[PDB]
Design a protein around this ligand. Sequence first.
Ligand SMILES: CC(C)CCC[C@@H](C)[C@H]1CC[C@H]2[C@@H]3CC=C4C[C@@H](O)CC[C@]4(C)[C@H]3CC[C@]12C
Ligand SMILES: CC(C)CCC[C@@H](C)[C@H]1CC[C@H]2[C@@H]3CC=C4C[C@@H](O)CC[C@]4(C)[C@H]3CC[C@]12C
Ligand SMILES: CC(C)CCC[C@@H](C)[C@H]1CC[C@H]2[C@@H]3CC=C4C[C@@H](O)CC[C@]4(C)[C@H]3CC[C@]12C
Ligand SMILES: OC[C@H]1O[C@H](O[C@H]2[C@H](O)[C@@H](O)[C@H](O)O[C@@H]2CO)[C@H](O)[C@@H](O)[C@@H]1O
Ligand SMILES: CC(C)NC[C@H](O)COc1cccc2[nH]c3ccccc3c12
Ligand SMILES: *C(=O)CCCCCCCCCCCCCCC
Length: 442
Amino acid sequence: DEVWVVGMGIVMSLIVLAIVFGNVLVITAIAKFERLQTVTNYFITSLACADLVMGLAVVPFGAAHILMKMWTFGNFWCEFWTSIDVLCVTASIETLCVIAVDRYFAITSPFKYQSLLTKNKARVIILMVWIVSGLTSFLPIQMHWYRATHQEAINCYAEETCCDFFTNQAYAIASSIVSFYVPLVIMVFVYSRVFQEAKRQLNIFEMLRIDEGLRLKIYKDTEGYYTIGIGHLLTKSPSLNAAKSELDKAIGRNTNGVITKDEAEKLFNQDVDAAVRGILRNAKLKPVYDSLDAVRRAALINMVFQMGETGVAGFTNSLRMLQQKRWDEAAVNLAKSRWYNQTPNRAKRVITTFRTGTWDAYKFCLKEHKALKTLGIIMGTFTLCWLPFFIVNIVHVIQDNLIRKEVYILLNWIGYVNSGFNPLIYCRSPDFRIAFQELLCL
Ligand SMILES: CC(C)CCC[C@@H](C)[C@H]1CC[C@H]2[C@@H]3CC=C4C[C@@H](O)CC[C@]4(C)[C@H]3CC[C@]12C
Ligand SMILES: CC(C)CCC[C@@H](C)[C@H]1CC[C@H]2[C@@H]3CC=C4C[C@@H](O)CC[C@]4(C)[C@H]3CC[C@]12C
Ligand SMILES: CC(C)CCC[C@@H](C)[C@H]1CC[C@H]2[C@@H]3CC=C4C[C@@H](O)CC[C@]4(C)[C@H]3CC[C@]12C
Ligand SMILES: OC[C@H]1O[C@H](O[C@H]2[C@H](O)[C@@H](O)[C@H](O)O[C@@H]2CO)[C@H](O)[C@@H](O)[C@@H]1O
Ligand SMILES: CC(C)NC[C@H](O)COc1cccc2[nH]c3ccccc3c12
Ligand SMILES: *C(=O)CCCCCCCCCCCCCCC
């Protein structure tokens, strides 16, 4: 009975520690490492501050309120504590919504993934988020717009040891819609469009960039030949200066061995053009290529890139089955090759692409697309943690007391606890992971 309290207290204490530790770590990492100082991470910092205030100002007293089964901190702080609670939750979803809109314009810009905002504009947006959140949180609570007019509530308001958030229905609807549901619906809609755009970026360039890899500096391939970009051969000569000469002649300037990503893309589009012409000249590959759709043509070109026309022309049975749109059977034969034995991962993705005729095998391979998934996980987690709580707010406007007080409280704490998840989710990023282990003396 009472020993349970200590055990429950230690648990809630660890919850507080977890929230504060992790979010302090996030703030520190972004503030300290110049690498992490991006527009997105400024919003993340704003998001981390809301969670940090939750862990310091909100959760500790909510915990004590439950364990003591009454309020000990007085009416002033009860009203203040309540305001902070609503503020941090509001600012969090508003920030998440800003991230979604920011990421949409970033991914649709010709200046792709660059935020249209500068660092200074971002701070203004952030500051305006906290002003609006405070305007929608503190005002109604400090002006007493939220309060109900029935006696049970009136008693709780007046008595100093009662801190129950009794609200009138108009507030319950309006506040929950404006603070939560409006930025939630926008966030979900906009960031679903972000994923659509991200998926739409997948093409043969990204495919070969994932499968072969893009190298900005001159390197020797497996055969010892000088190569650059996505496996673009410069020369078979052992002279490095001969490669540099061919590179300059191809790119159109003094490169000294180094080219940009966009220039590698330029060379790649030429190599693709060359590959297709060669395919159409090959009597064994032409009928297959002619029959295939655009996506599977990219798959065939991918193979030609890796093995050359001759190596690909040797897949006589597979080519026949591909030509007849017998995908699974083509997949069975292709999986039984030296190709699949040497580069299974790459072969797995190309063969799967032959099977589906989509880019699904190349989802979330790019570092930038992985980063988008991380943000999507942040948003989804926040949604899942808070949605049940806010559904019950509306349900009780329809019919009050349908759901127990203890369940409603538990749904609140699922919301509270969410403030400790984001730091763990950021470990998906190689940059934060590197940042953290530096900060943690590793
Ligand atoms: C009234 C009390 C309880 C609420 C606390 C308000 C604090 C947490 C709010 C108010 C203004 C906010 C900030 C506004 C400006 C930015 C700049 C950005 O680069 C990092 C976050 C940062 C610094 C915000 C984080 C937290 C912040 C300081
Ligand atoms: C409001 C009370 C109860 C909670 C304590 C507020 C603390 C957590 C808030 C208030 C102002 C905030 C800061 C405001 C300014 C920034 C600069 C930014 O580059 C890093 C975070 C940093 C340094 C914030 C971190 C935490 C911060 C200090
Ligand atoms: C009243 C309670 C909430 C206060 C507890 C604050 C804890 C979470 C604070 C107090 C001292 C802090 C640490 C102090 C030293 C560093 C090294 C730094 O490179 C990374 C963060 C790190 C590791 C801090 C993280 C969290 C930390 C442990
Ligand atoms: O065979 C056509 C392409 O071959 C090179 O790119 C290959 C390279 O030969 C090989 O060592 C490696 O395993 O794969 C890459 C591509 O994945 C050419 O220099 C390309 O320009 C040709 O199109
Ligand atoms: C112990 C209570 C005070 N905790 C409140 C929730 O953590 C956050 O609740 C909200 C956040 C944002 C907007 C809100 N509108 C509401 C209407 C009724 C109840 C809560 C909220 C609410
Ligand atoms: C490498 O960065 C790891 C070493 C950092 C150790 C710093 C020592 C922190 C002491 C924590 C005590 C504060 C507790 C506050 C409780 C209210």
